[PDB]
């Protein structure tokens, strides 16, 4: 084939990037996050009790309104860092961009308020490998590859910086290739450690001059569903001490006036230095010395087998356009524009 279709993404406050998919005949519409760190598709179900307030606030799939719906009913539970959604498997036609596929997805009947009552999106489209798929369900990019329509068996991500009072493009994913209008120069490609997870070798993490962390190598999950960069608690505690940042209940903060003076943070991937300046990783709402500003970095201890591992999320992808290569099992990086 020769198709390279794209999906416009919305940017809610640099922490939630979501686009649209359509499920069923006629299509039912859902805002969903495209997540390279999970491998299942799920949307809230009409059979979800209104006791769950998330199911009152979000859009629900109604199986009985779709002629292309096909019942399965097998129970499904999805484990995340924050917790758990639960429900049953269903099958229907799913449209994403110009591509339509028959997909097995989860109809979710238990959505906890923490965190989904803070989600501007409805569900998740997992972009990982079948090795991580609960129920061993075939992931959606697998079925898309099966259609022989993509120009190349790749997909790529662009996350823009949030613009207030402007209609700037929030984000864009491309199925089948990459958009040169949103990256300059050529891709630098880094092979996966193993098929089954969008994870690469990392050789060091620098706070300015000194290689403070990960000197003998660590892991880096490239996670399009992660809002912040994350590392192990041990690493992040050392990183924040070097930055002079204080911890609150939720976030790591610095005084807003001191933000731009913070040293760069460099991730050593594929023998190249991927640097994020304080202008890249600090939510700079003000410059007042009597106000604290959030860093887009926090600790998340990911358990075996995927972890311990860093997660390069939106904080990282905002600066580096990312191409996920299924055919050659690699990840490409190029400076975002
Ligand atoms: C998208 C999947 C997901 C899972 C769990 C929680 C959330 C979530 C939420 F439900 C409400 C608000 C915020 C969030 C997140 O911040 C992610 C937003 C969507 N992703 C995105 O746009 O990325 C650029 C999560 C809050 C807890 C920590 N976290 C994760 O662990 C992400 C895991 C996804 N990869 C497996 C982010 C999202
Ligand atoms: C804003 C403080 C904070 C710190 C850490 C986590 C969270 C948090 C949460 F506890 C539950 C759900 C969602 C979130 C966040 O989405 C952070 C993303 C999770 N990190 C990640 O990617 O892990 C892998 C926040 C929810 C409120 C808005 N937000 C901000 O960052 C607001 C900062 C702007 N200040 C001006 C995200 C919030
Ligand atoms: C549900 O899926 C499994 C395969 O993953 C299949 O064996 C079973 O028959 C399906 N259920 C229905 C009702 O088709």
Curated annotation (Swiss-Prot):
Active site: 35, 223
Carbohydrate attachment residues: 2, 72
Places the protein is found: Secreted; Membrane
This protein's GO CC annotations: apical part of cell; extracellular region; extracellular space; plasma membrane
A GO biological process held by the record: angiotensin maturation
Segments forming domain Peptidase A1: 17-334
Reactions performed catalytically: Cleavage of Leu-|-Xaa bond in angiotensinogen to generate angiotensin I
Source domain of life: Eukaryota
Enzyme nomenclature, EC number: 3.4.23.15
GO MF annotations, alphabetized: aspartic-type endopeptidase activity; insulin-like growth factor receptor binding; peptidase activity; signaling receptor binding
First-listed, main subcellular location of the protein, grouped into a coarse class: secreted
Keywords, sorted A to Z: Aspartyl protease, Cleavage on pair of basic residues, Disease variant, Disulfide bond, Glycoprotein, Hydrolase, Membrane, Protease, Secreted, Signal, Zymogen
Regulation of activity: Interaction with ATP6AP2 results in a 5-fold increased efficiency in angiotensinogen processing.
Top EC class of this enzyme: hydrolase
Paired cysteines (S-S): 48-55, 214-218, 256-293
Associated disease: Renal tubular dysgenesis: Autosomal recessive severe disorder of renal tubular development characterized by persistent fetal anuria and perinatal death, probably due to pulmonary hypoplasia from early-onset oligohydramnios (the Potter phenotype).
Family: Belongs to the peptidase A1 family.
Quaternary data: Interacts with ATP6AP2.
Protein task: Renin is a highly specific endopeptidase, whose only known function is to generate angiotensin I from angiotensinogen in the plasma, initiating a cascade of reactions that produce an elevation of blood pressure and increased sodium retention by the kidney.
Name of the featured protein: Renin
Organism, as annotated: Homo sapiens (Human)
First-to-last residue of the parent protein present: 70 to 406 of 406
């Amino acid at each position: 084939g020769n198709t390279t279709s794209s999906v416009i993404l919305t940017n809610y406050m640099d922490t939630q990037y979501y686009g649209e998919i359509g499920i069923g005949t006629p299509p039912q519409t859902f805002k969903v996050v495209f997540d390279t760190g999970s491998s299942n598709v799920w949307v809230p179900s009409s059979k979800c009790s209104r006791l769950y307030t998330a199911c009152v606030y979000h859009k629900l799939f109604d199986a009985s309104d779709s002629s292309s719906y096909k019942h399965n009913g097998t129970e499904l539970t999805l484990r995340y860092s924050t917790g758990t959604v639960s429900g049953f498997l269903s099958q229907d036609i799913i449209t994403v961009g110009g591509i339509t596929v028959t997909q097995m997805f989860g109809e979710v009947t238990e959505m906890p308020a923490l965190p989904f009552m803070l989600a501007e999106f409805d569900g998740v489209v997992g972009m990982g490998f079948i090795e991580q798929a609960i129920g061993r369900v075939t992931p959606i990019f697998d079925n898309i590859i099966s259609q022989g329509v993509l120009k190349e068996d790749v997909f790529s991500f662009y996350y823009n910086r949030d613009s207030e009072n402007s209609q700037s493009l929030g984000g864009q994913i491309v199925l089948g290739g990459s958009d040169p209008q949103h990256y300059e120069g050529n891709f630098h490609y880094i092979n996966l450690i193993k098929t089954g997870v969008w994870q690469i070798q990392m050789k060091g993490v620098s706070v300015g001059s000194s290689t403070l962390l990960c000197e003998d190598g660590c892991l880096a999950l490239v996670d399009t569903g992660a809002s912040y960069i994350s590392g192990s608690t041990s690493s992040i505690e050392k990183l924040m001490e070097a930055l002079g940042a204080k911890k609150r209940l939720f976030d790591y903060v610095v005084k807003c006036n001191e933000g731009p003076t913070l040293p760069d943070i460099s991730f050593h991937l594929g023998g190249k230095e991927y640097t994020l300046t304080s202008a890249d990783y600090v939510f700079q709402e003000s410059y007042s010395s009597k106000k604290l500003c959030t860093l887009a970095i926090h600790a998340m201890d990911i358990p075996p087998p995927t972890g311990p591992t860093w997660a390069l999320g939106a904080t990282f992808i905002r600066k580096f356009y990312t191409e996920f290569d299924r055919r050659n099992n690699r990840i490409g990086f190029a400076l975002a524009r």
